[model samples]
Structures are given as structure tokens and as C-alpha cells.
Target: DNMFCNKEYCNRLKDENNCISNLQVEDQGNCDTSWIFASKYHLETIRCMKGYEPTKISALYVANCYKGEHKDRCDEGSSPMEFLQIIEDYGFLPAESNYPYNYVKVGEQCPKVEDHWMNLWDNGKILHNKNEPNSLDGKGYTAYESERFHDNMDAFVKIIKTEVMNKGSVIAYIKAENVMGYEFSGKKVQNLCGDDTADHAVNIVGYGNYVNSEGEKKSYWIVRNSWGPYWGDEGYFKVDMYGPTHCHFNFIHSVVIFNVDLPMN
Candidate 1:
């Protein structure tokens, strides 16, 4: 995998991004619910203050976009901003325990809610650090009332740390082909499916240093995936900050931060 990614540069970022804080992992269960898990559940994990209780939003509610299609719980693909609008329009509902994930995307009934709703205010797009910015803005997006995406001026540790983990967590896209084999384990992941196309969306929770199978000092991106606890390290895995597994470098993200910065007084 180091065939492309520069280990020197990747760790250069690791050293720069010392921002701590990666919360617990959550599972999306049977649905391709990564969009919801990362956008809603995990985002809130970073937004909440330590002294108070935290909130868990409902994925079953948002996962039903194209109910008639097989992508009910999942989609051919959906953006993090699209999922953010769901909470903004409907309000934040209770966890799967109080309401339970029903996967209503597949023609089932959504548990009637009398409790909460949360909506996304601003939305935008993010190009990889080097890719020239796309000209077209997301206009006339009617999938739901999400904000027009603005592009991110964006990677693994520096971006994930200063941009994502430091703020909370981000919903990122990954290239996950041929991952069904050795790539699907709890161990530190490095097998990349080749190319830089994005296939799956996941939660970029936190980053850290660790000792790999070879007892070498390694730094990796800790991710919370949608595929329940049965997969990865109790539903989480560490990706090499550098290539040949640069999923984090090629990642796309959207984040929400609570607390006020109060303009530049």
C-alpha cells in the first residue's frame, strides 16, 4: 500500500495534529446506515459537553429515503449533508432503544414520534486537498431541504484532527472494494482496493498512535463503521494514516460543532 502514499508526509501530519478526543463506536446494523451513524450519532458525540448527557439520533427515520428501492436502509449513495437535513427537518429522536431501529426504508412503518427533531443549517462540498475545486454548487437539491453545499478548503491526521476529530467527528467516504476478505477485520487495516474512487461512507471518529502487528510505532485513523459489532475491532478499525491505504487522505467530510465562538470580536 505504501506504493503511493508517502509515509514521511503522512506522519508529518500525525505530529501536527495532536488534538485528542475520539468517542465510542456505534453500529448501523442491517442497513447501509453509515450516513446516519456518522452524521447523526457520532457527530453529536463530539458536540455534547462532558458534564451533561449526550443524545443519540435515529437512523431508521432517515434511512427510508428511497423506500421503494432496495437501497431503502441504504442508498446507491447519499451525502452527509443530506442526512444532516433529516435531523434539522425532523428533529433529533431517541436512540434505537427508546424507538428502536425499524429500517422503515423497506416499506415498514416508522415508529411514530412525538419527541424530537433536528435540522442541518448550512451544507457544502469538499474536494480533496489537491483536486481543483468543482465550479457547480449543489443547487435545486430537493431530496430533502438540505443546505446548498459549500466546498471544503481541505486528510488523515491534520485534516481529521484540526478539521474533524478536533471539532467532533466527520462523515467520510472510503474506497472499500475487495474489503470483504482480509480488509474486514479488527486489526489495523492497510489493504486498499486500488484507485482512489470513493465507495463507502464512514465515521472518522479519532486518530492515535499504536503498536502494529510488527511492533512498530504506527499512527492510524480510528473509524466507526455501519456494519455492526460483528465486524472490525468491535465495530471499529484503524486505517494507516499513509498509503498504500490512504482512505483517510481521499476522504470527504461534513461536521457540526456546538458551543459558540462568538465571531471575531
Candidate 2:
């Protein structure tokens, strides 16, 4: 690794790039497994903040288990909530090294859920090794159903903002058609360039502002995608914070909060 510091922007880049770099921009190939990648990155951001070295959580693990009717192929589009029951039962999911993403072998019977694999989330947060007595940490992370908080838009915005600011990334539901068609020209996009229907998932890593064509600063969400670094702004893009619907800006989704019992460090 080369170490050359830009005296002017070094501090800024170091502070910001650490979080972005830790979560590598991954590629899902031709698989409709964006939901799986989003779920993995959701937890990956938490591990990154915990000071754990950047690690790859297997998208295959979740994909294999929740692929639904398209069990023989990678064309299935599913929900992040499918991970709820699986993690509840298995208490462990492996890394990409253990079970790599093999889109060709889409529905291979998942290997036995074993202990050596990474412990993602147990009854609460993964507390100890499999053989060890489960820690009596009553505080646990819960996954809420993925429904738009339509009744209270303000509450939904606050929940996502607070989670991204204090905890980790939150999963965002977006119109896949719009996102896939987005060109990397605008620093932050506001207009609906494609279909307005929500059909895909991404992670809202952070938030910031950008100057629009009108020279006015506007708010946007810093979103990470699974489409590899070749797409968009190095596999990331910005979206206007809110649209006419909750699904805009990847806002229709869930956030995981750590409690007092969890080991943040």
C-alpha cells in the first residue's frame, strides 16, 4: 500500500473514506439478489463501526435460503425480512469465502449451518461462540416488517436519519427501474427518470447535500449498491431525500438498532 497524504483533504478523506471503503462495492452478477446483498451490507456496516476488519458476509447464504420459487435460478426477487426466521433459527451465516456467490449453482442445498461460520445475530446480537453459554443480554436487535410508514412520514424520516447517523446503514426500498437507469452525471438526482414503482433494495449509508443545477443546495441520501464499482459513482449514487412517496430515496425499509447489551466496541 502506498502512503501519500494530501495535506489539504487528507483529514476529510480519511474520516469519510474509512466507512465507504470498508464496505466494498460488490457485484451480484445477473442475479436478482440485490435484496440479499443489501441485507449483508446492512450488517456489514455495523461490523465496520465495531472496529472489525472489513469482511464479506456471504450473499449466497441468504440467497440460498430465501430464493423462494425460483430455487433453480437466480431470477427470484425476495425480501430482506426473509432473513429474520433464518437467522433466528440458525444463529449463524458464513462469509463469502465459505460459500461464495455461485449464481450458476443457484439453488444448491445450503451446507449444514455450522458454528465456525461467522455469527451474525443470535437471540440478540451474536454474543459468543456456539458452544459457549448464551449471554444473558436481554437487549437484542429486531427486524421490523417492511411496510411503508405512510401513516407518519416524519417518523419514518426521523427513524432512517437517526439510524444512519448513530447506528449503521439502513436497507432502502427503491424503484429498480429508476436506479438501474441512472446515469452518473448528477451528483444527486431528484427527478423521476424512470419507472416510479419500487422493486429493488439498497443501503442508505449516509446523507449529505449537493448543489443542484439551480445553484441551490439540496439534501440527498448516500446509497450503496451491489452492482459493482463500475456502475454509477463507483457503485454508489445519490438520491433526493424524499419524493412523492415513501419509497423515494430508498426510504421504504428497515433499520436495526443496537441495545445496551450489545458490544459496540
Candidate 3:
């Protein structure tokens, strides 16, 4: 009795089989299990690679401490001001770490809900919805919306003054690469949300740019991203003058600043 030989099911299992066949003996156990049940399991294996460890202490620190009530975890490595400077030195925007202004990095793992919310949680400003698929339309402005970048930048500066620095501040821009998406020139991803891009995100703390009589010569914004230094301009990127998408800036989602603060140890 070949219980695993259904033609329809077998066809579906082909991919799963191939996936398994491609795994290393040690890693096969860690792979997603749903893909294992298909018939012809040998035919369903997908090439899988091992995860890489971060080489830089800063990167490891950010990844481990940025999440949860542990926001202050990075504080021990460097003071908040020093931390901001280090990120800026690497070319990322050191935006105020408070609501609406600092709440952008969401949907990622963290120690606390508020800690992982990003820059948008620092200020109370938000962008108005525009026409963009899979974005928070009408609900609030998202980082994808190019038009709202300036408003977002302005709000970012305001928050830093009132909250983070409580004095003057400077923000830098960081860029990263999206490995799996056709949108920005990469392979098309299977899932919509999963579709990757050389897509980039930004963090804003304070703003300054070179200007000429004609107007702003080179309007720039400070931003940050997760891609390592090898990816974009040594891990820091700059935005064009005028708005977020002015220089290939795209997408805007929401702008709700949460009041939750990072917990103390």
C-alpha cells in the first residue's frame, strides 16, 4: 500500500523532496518541516545556506540590544550621545529615540513592543496616506510615500529637541541592499510581503544640507538601515534634497508614536 503515492500530492511534494535533498546533514533538522512531507522528497530540496555571524561589535550590539526593554543595553557600550555619533560616523541618521519621530522599525523582533517600534515612536507627527499598494493607505502616512519625507524629517528634528538630545543634534543617512526582489532589480520573491528589494529605510535625528542661491543645492536627510557595511556606502546612505523619495526614496507606511519607554534593568 503506497500511501504516499497520490499523483496530485506527489507533484506538490516534488519541491519538498528537492528541498530536503539539498540540505546539509546538520542543517536538515532545522529547516521548515512543512516542505518535508511531499512525495519524491528527493526532488523537492531547495539550496539552503548557513546564517552568518556579525563581525563588528556595533552591529552585534544593535541587533541584540535594539530590541525589547533592552534599549539601554547599547548604553553600556556607549552613551546615548556616543551611540548616536557612532551610527552617524558609519553614515546612518541618528534620529531621536522617541515617538512619531523615532518609530519606524516595526514588525521586527525586539525585547519590548515600544523598543522595537523605531523612530515613529518619538514624535506625534504622521504622514497622510497616498496611493501605494500593500501600504497603510488612509490609515496614516508610511515611509514609502515620497511626498511625506520632508514632513517626516521636520517632525524628526522637533522630537530630538524635545526628547532625545534636548539640545542640538545631527542626523546621518545609511543605505542597505535588498537581496530578494525584482522591484529594485533583484529576483522576484514568492510572497508579497516577502518580496525583497534593494529597498532601504532611513532614520532622522536632525537635518542639514548644502544649498545655493537657486535653492537647496543638495538636500539631504539622515537615515539608517540593517544591511552591513559591505552593502551600501559602508552602511550609511544619504537622501536627496526636497523629500524622502526625491532620490529614489519610496514607500511610507504609518506614523503613530507610542509612549512606551524602554525598561530599566
Candidate 4:
């Protein structure tokens, strides 16, 4: 966790988005639905704990999936645990296949399957999305506490590594500014940052070590962000294990399906 010493990040390409080109990075748009989008995938993963249900693994519409989608940082920006619970209790809508990423907040119910549109014309117009189905059952626990998150974010890197290595995913938090300046350079970030509050959330999909042509050891986290692909590493970004941009595992969590192989939501 100490080999990385680079301070410069990927070149900010005014014309392009980022280094990782193969991954799909959903644009959260201006909506504060980051937490909703962040935990939806894990919530979907937990939905399968009961059994292998071929629901086409729909992605969730922020407003369609959670009634409290736009709660505001004062009330909206709660922990991923809260969002995970809401997901477990209310079930998710099929969000895949161009699931519309609009500002449509939650209504009384999720729209029907036919409403899952992503954009409106060339402009990013809002659209009503699919109403998938009841509290998709899920369970979650704390991966880290504040005390540990500060002095031991490395623990999160290990936790994320285990999640990715053991199962392949984790929902995590990191300092907001650490990732704010990232541009679409399509290169891995190896900046060493000071410790800070991880107020932002993200999904840690995978991880690996980065070695340049000279073989410098640069470990990183593979993250899936709610920010549109035009922002960071093609909607994904690699935070150096030695830097603060990497996942802060202290409060990182894994949502497990609470179903016992039974007919649950």
C-alpha cells in the first residue's frame, strides 16, 4: 500500500471521458439520486439470493425504484444502509436495456415495464420508467466505522479486494473531492491524497495492481459511478490503493439477500 508515489492523474481530455472504455457508467445526471443508483446493483444481487430468477436483471430507475428518491442532502443523503433497506422493502424496477436516467422522482408506484426509456431524443430528457416489483429482500452490515475509516481506509481496499476477489463487488464511500477533478483521460489515477471524510458513495466492482512500463506497483480500486461516463474513467475510475480516492472500506458494505431459498420478492 505504499509503492505508489505519483501525484498527477489522467490527462483531462476535453473531448473524451476516460481510460476504461469497456464498462457502462450510468450518468446520475443532476439528480441527487447517487445513493439510489449506488446501492441498486447490490440490491439486485441480493434479489437473487433466493434463487436464480431471470428478471433480465433490470437496472433500477432512481425515482421509480425508491419513493424517497429526492430527499436532499439534509434528508436524502443518508447512508447506503438506509437505501439498501428501502430497496429490500420496496423491490426494484427493471433498469437494464437503456433504463431511462431521468430526474423523475418517485410516485405512488413504479411505472410498468414499458416505461423503461433512457433518454429523450438527442437531449437527455426525463422519462417515466418501469415498475419492477415488493421489497426485494436484502440484509446489510457495517464494513467500517468512522474511527477505523480514517486511520484504516486501507482496510476498505482489502475489503473491496475480498468482495471483488471473493464475490466481485462492494458498495463503498470516499472523499468527494478526491474524485472531483478526474477527467476523461482514459488513464488510471495514481494520486496520493490526504485522508478526508468519505461523504460520497459508489459501487466497487473490481480491483487490480497497476504497473507501468517500468513496473511501478500501483494498486487501485475499480469503481462504477453514478456520474455519466463523460466524467471520469469512462464512468469508472481507478483510485490508487495508496491514495485517499480509493474506497474507504470502514463503512463500505455488502447487501445480502435475506431470503432462505424461499419464494421471496
Candidate 5:
């Protein structure tokens, strides 16, 4: 069956208070930490919708603790999925209060604690999202699972819309370098971003269309960036819903959505 999104089908999670959670826009600052921020925001939304209060996860903890193959730093970026893997293995992340984010500098070292210790101890522990029926079955270490899609615009649109409409938000990889200079004014950014490499990661909170003065309807994806709330439509922008060649949003090389049971509430 075809479940693609239509121009008339607009659903913004920000507008859905009952099923969705409200969160403040996040800032990644001068670091290539969009991956961390994107993952943090998506996870926060998932937790909130599951009946937990709106709370923040520690992006700084992931940035500092995740000593994986990909260097999680300002110069070299880290993969959001990889960061989730560590969270799953560790089973928890501290709150933003315990590990606050500021103008983080490069070459900061992770604390000298074992990853599992962060889970077992309470000092650094903030909130550990329960992993649904898995926890009911006793082994709740697996807190979350993820699905990743690549280079499939048609299927991508369908799944993204479905996920947002039901669960909450998704992590999207897009051509960030292409639109670094564009000014966002709560309007649809036209199809100018070319099909290029996806250098940035963002959160897809909603989807809708904007009818221009000429009455031409242009579809777009409502996305939240980690560039702070002062930039681009208050830290949100719309991506042209067309494919890469035309709208550049189709240049989205990868999209990821996480699945977990609502164990809280």
C-alpha cells in the first residue's frame, strides 16, 4: 500500500500536546556535535511521549564518554546511531544538570569511570529509560533499537511521516553544508540545496506545506537543528519534500528512527 505524505497532510509534533512532548531548542555551539544533539533530542521526545516528564539527556556525557572509532569532537563528527549503541549498552545517560553543556572545547577527556559503572552507580546516574517488555521479561539492558534507511526517498518519506505521526521524532542526515548560508524565515526554503554530501544531523519533528502568495503549494519537513535557537526560524527549518536533485532534502543520505515500548507513565 502507498502511504506517502501529501501536500495537505500536515502534522507538527509541536502542535500535538497530548501525544507529544514539548522541548526547548538545543544548541550544539561551535562543535560538530549535531549528532549528539540530534540523538539527545530524539531520545528526550521518545521518553516524554512514553509518559515521562520533559527532561534533557546529557549530550556532553555522550560527547565525552563515547570513545568509539569515530572521534566525537569539533573537527571530526560522531555517528548518532553509534552514540545510541553506547547508550543501549550502558543503559542510561546522566541529566543535563549533572553534566551541563557550555562552550565545550576540543580535546576534552572523558572521566575515568567504566561505562557500566555509570549505569550501576547513582551519583552520575540521572534517568534510565526502561526497555519495555524486555524489562518485563527481566533483561532490560536493551533500552532501545533503531532502524536506518538510506537513499530511498519514497520509502523514507512514508516511514518518517508514519513515525512522527505515531511515535514522535526521527534523526535525519542532510546536506548541512549546502544551506549553511541560507536565511530561514519560517518559510519553506526553496529547492536550492543541491544533492550533496550529508554533513549535518537534525531532528524531524513535523511535516507540512506552505502555500505561497501565488497559491503554489510547496511541501516541506519541519526540522530542528542544534545550531541554537537564535538561528534559522528559531532553530528550526523546513526542507523541501522533493528528492535530492530538486529540493536537496532528498540528498538526505541517511535517516534513523528508534523503537521502544512505553514502559513509563
Candidate 6:
């Protein structure tokens, strides 16, 4: 029998990979997988044709039912230690370093690629709502006047004290961007420039802005970025302790943890 194209079989393949194929063939007696092309244009058409609507309902469901416990609820947003624990819980081995700057590709196919950066913030929001109600908006540091940032940081420090340090909480500072000028240090600095323009985001863990004996007023932040060790101070970049072009400086957002233990129901 001449090679025949079966529409049913083709349909099965199409559904298998989310409809990137079509169940049709050319007039010639040849079955070509390439012939049934569903280019980006066609894939988009199929999505609209079927009235497919991507909903957040599924994600919300999984997050609500997630059973495993993290270090603490306040740890859900922007704490490096908490994020590390969450990644392990989801079965991802920790990378050699904690920086995610160079490793973050726009549409990466890695296991937790989609959950990087701002995605973590959103997950923090969801998980915070379910677990830590007061700390929901605490992780994000968008504007200077944001009260939630201060509230969340206070809570974060408390967790570090009781859980990690075993001593009273240390006097934490926000590491405002004005102190450091035009120098990249491995500390948290706000990319006043929005995403795509500034390739990294991190938290200011520590700093020293005191003038040295030479009378040069030096300043710097202890920043922690997500890029792996291959780039920028071993996955950390010490940025100038000053504001970027925009006066809006010192904006550091938190990393939220998502519950990945739920099965795809």
C-alpha cells in the first residue's frame, strides 16, 4: 500500500503537543510531517479558533492545596535562604551559586525557568495570601514610599533572627542607592531602569558608605543577584551606590516561593 496519511493519527499527534500539527495531506500520495505545517501564525489561529483562554484558576488551585511547609510564611518573599529551600522541595538541585543574572533567558526551558524573577513575586503574593496574610505586599520594593516594603523587611529580619541567627534581629538597612556612585559592587541595587533595559535585579544585603582615611567618601551595597557565578562578581554585582538616571532609586523587590508539590490535576 502506498504511504497513506491518516487524519485520525495526525489529530492525535496534534493534541499531544498542544495543537502544533494539522490533520491534512497534499494531493500526492506522500505523508509528510513537514507538509502538515502549523507555523506560529497557524498555532495562534488555532488558539483563537478554539476560544482557548489561559486562566489563573489552575495555578491558584495548586497553590492553595500545596501541603509541604517552607521555613516560614514571611520567608515566602525575597529571602535567599527561603528560596533555596523551596527549590529543593520541588526536586531541583541547587546550582553552584545563588546568582540568576546570566542564567535567566527570556523563554528558557529549564525546570523552574518560568518561575524566575517577577514570577516568583507573583507566587509570593499567592502563597502569602494563603499562608501569611500580613506579609502579602511586604516583599516588593517598587517605590520609596511603599509601607509594605518596610513591613515585609521587618518581618523578614525577624525570621532571620529567630530561625537562622538565634540572636536578636540585627539592625537592617535598606541600602539606599544614593550612597554608592557609578561602581558595581556585589550588593543589592535597584535597576531604576525597568526590565529588558537593566539585565539584573537583586537585594541589598549589606553595605559600607563611610569615608576612608584619605577623605574619599566611598559607598557600596552588598547585593545578591540571581545570575550564576559565571557573570558579575560570582552571580553578585556590586552596583554604584547611587541612583541611575531616574531619580527613582532603591527599588528592590522580593522573591516569592511557589508550592510546586501539587500534581497536575
Best by TM-score: 5
Instruction: Estimate TM-scores for all models.
Output: 0.60, 0.72, 0.27, 0.58, 0.73, 0.27
Kindly indicate the candidate among 2 and 4 with the higher TM-score: 2
Q: What lDDT tens digits, residue by residue, belong to model 3 across residues 1-265?
A: 0222221111111244432222212111111111111110111111010111111121222323332243322222222223333232332211223211111232124333344433311222223445568655643211222234545755543443232121111222222232223343321111111112322223332223455444645434322223334433333333333432333433222111212122211
**Candidate 1 structure quality by residue, lDDT tens digits, 162-188:** 534334455566655534566567565
Q: Each candidate: how many clashes?
A: 18, 0, 66, 14, 0, 25
How would you encode candidate 5's per-residue C-alpha lDDT over 146-264 as one tens digit per residue? 12333555566776777665556788777677557645555555455445457788877777767654566766777888877787887787767663343423544566666444465
Candidate 4 per-residue lDDT, tens place, 96-172, comes to 56554455433324556465443211111111233335343233443544345467656645554554432324566
Query: Which candidate gets the maximum lDDT versus the true structure?
Result: 5
Overall local distance difference test of candidate 6: 0.27
- Candidates' RMSD to native: 9.6, 7.3, 23.0, 11.0, 7.2, 22.5
lDDT, model 3: 0.26
Against the reference, the lDDT scores of all candidates come to 0.46, 0.60, 0.26, 0.47, 0.62, 0.27
In candidate 2, what are the lDDT values of residues 67-164, reduced to their tens digit?
A: 23545438877666565545655666678877878677566776776657665543335333343366643333334323445456556656666666
**Deviation of model 5 at 148, angstroms:** 12
Looking at model 3, residue 30 earns an lDDT score of 17
- Residue 200 in candidate 4 has what lDDT? 66
Lowest lDDT 10-mer window, candidate 5? 138-147
Q: Put the candidates in lDDT order, highest first.
A: 5, 2, 4, 1, 6, 3
Candidate 2 worst ten-residue window by lDDT: 1-10
Q: Is candidate 2 or candidate 3 better by TM-score?
A: 2
Native-structure RMSD, model 1: 9.6
